[PDB]
Write a protein that binds this ligand. Structure first.
Ligand SMILES: *C(=O)[C@H](C[C@@H]1CCNC1=O)NC(=O)[C@H](CC1CCCCC1)NC(=O)c1cc2ccccc2[nH]1
Ligand SMILES: *C(=O)[C@H](C[C@@H]1CCNC1=O)NC(=O)[C@H](CC1CCCCC1)NC(=O)c1cc2ccccc2[nH]1
Lengths: 296, 294
């Protein structure tokens, strides 16, 4: 069991470089529109309290240099949607995949294609934390990189990168420019909320462990949802909702370990620790695989 | 800090499906050649005579499909443990590529594929015992490992089999196995593995370059004394080449290699006492000095 990213070729073909004055970052080219963070129109002067409408009315089409590899794309229109800028260009991307813009929920995973200067550099799997940040790996110029899932030839874009918080975790928007989490595109003091562990993902990961031959943590017991939730609250774990139990249904049946039976295992893991042992290859309870991620 | 794979698009455009008899696996289509594991021609698995198995095949016994398109095989030959199927059509999306043979400790991306269609991408390392700790299911054979550098894809691994311990064995793209393995279903066992010491040190440098110094100390060590200690924890010996390779990261952080060796010695002695390094509760050994810089 390894953390696995989706194959990224369909998205690589959509990445372009956007330059506005002094700032260069990445854009997502789909049909005849390039999408990118609206903060690309900020200078050092504006970054602390921008008036994005004002700054945008100032700009004209030729203020944006869009580069698809060696080819410059001519901007013929510009617009803002929430915190994303939409640059209408000369030419529709001839490799636009089947795609959707989707908004994901905390606890869900996606692949990140990290890009610099419009050129894809690396790909890795992320989870939307319960505090709406991303534990990413993003350097200067990574803004505009996207997160996505693929479902049978259809790419669902869910994330575009905007910022790094002082703790080193990351914040961005969906592709309609709506931020994940209580963050703003302003150079002001911002902090992530206290994070919590994604309980249903930990359980799915334990089921993944049983499937792969590590069963030392299983026991004979079972808990209640109410009793397990008091434990989860003590250890900063997301409450296990009744719907969470249902999505684990397939894994309980394949292994014969009922969810509250596996919760009894997790309950004890939260106190005995691992007693010097390892679960999959990890000395920590891993919470960035969804039930779907384990089954696939 | 993440285990990052290379973008897989250039390799996705090369994956095809090869069927021989009742067996389907993946092939790598570059120009007018499809490369795949020669054991696609087995029915036979304990003591195959591949020379005899192959002379009985004709071109039409190999069904090659690139997506919906069937590729006509016009010839075939065997190069060590890989089959080279000459096809009627050159891959129009062949990238700039090379075939490279890697040494233990080297990392690469794996594009896991099934029925010629890519399924996922992840980072991997060649273990000191010439296995890889992959994630491969039935039908993954022919999946390839690669690095990409300046739009040039360097293919270094093709998947052949799973050992009884659950680790994986395969060949370079000229069909020479990594390690003492053969394409037979006989009893073969990965030798005892070790931790890639040079990679653990690179990663501790990465920890320093980011924010963390809590594991440093005031000691140094000789290279010989470090190796005498580290081998008691099943670490690979550190060589002068490894010390040289770490020079750039040493000079960038101000921490002499042997001073970082002293810190590693103490980390092995003490554990991390409830802390993490980068993101991990264990000493990570699948990042190379090169991976850290990039
Ligand atoms: C876009 O490419 C970068 C990506 C950052 C750079 C470093 N690591 C990343 O992920 N985005 C930024 O640099 C933003 C730009 C701002 C423009 C105006 C609106 C808000 C975003 N800045 C930051 O991410 C930033 C500034 C800052 C200051 C002090 C501590 C942390 C910190 N992070
Ligand atoms: C190719 O697709 C598969 C990949 C395997 C399947 C499961 N996980 C993998 O990586 N390759 C095989 O199944 C090989 C078949 C050839 C191997 C040698 C030459 C002829 C056939 N077999 C194994 O990987 C295998 C069989 C086996 C039996 C008992 C213990 C371990 C074991 N591994």
């Amino acid at each position: 069991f390894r953390k696995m990213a989706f194959p990224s070729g369909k998205v690589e073909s959509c990445m372009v470089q956007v330059t506005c004055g002094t700032t260069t970052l990445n854009g997502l080219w789909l049909d005849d529109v390039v999408y990118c963070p609206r903060h690309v129109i900020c200078t050092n002067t504006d970054m602390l309290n921008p008036n994005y409408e004002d700054l945008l009315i100032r700009k004209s089409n030729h203020n944006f240099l869009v580069q698809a590899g060696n080819v410059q794309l001519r901007v013929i229109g510009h617009s803002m949607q929430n915190c994303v800028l939409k640059l209408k260009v000369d030419t529709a991307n001839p490799k636009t995949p089947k795609y959707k813009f989707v908004r994901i929920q905390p606890g869900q995973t996606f692949s990140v294609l990290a890009c610099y200067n419009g050129s894809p550099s690396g790909v890795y799997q992320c989870a939307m934390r319960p505090n709406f940040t991303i534990k990413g790996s993003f350097l200067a110029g990574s803004c505009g990189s996207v997160g996505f899932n693929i479902d049978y030839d259809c790419v669902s874009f869910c994330y575009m990168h905007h910022m790094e918080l002082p703790t080193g975790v990351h914040a961005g928007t969906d592709l309609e420019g709506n931020f994940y989490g209580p963050f703003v595109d302003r150079q002001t003091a911002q902090a992530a909320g206290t994070d919590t562990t994604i309980t249903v993902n930990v359980l799915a990961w334990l089921y993944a462990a049983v499937i792969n031959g590590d069963r030392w943590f299983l026991n004979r017991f079972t808990t209640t949802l109410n009793d397990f939730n008091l434990v989860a609250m003590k250890y900063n774990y997301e409450p296990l909702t009744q719907d969470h139990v249902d999505i684990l249904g397939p894994l309980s049946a394949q292994t014969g370990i009922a969810v509250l039976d596996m919760c009894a295992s997790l309950k004890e893991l939260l106190q005995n620790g691992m007693n010097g042992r390892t679960i999959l290859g990890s000395a920590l309870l891993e919470d960035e695989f969804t039930p779907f991620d384990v089954v696939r």
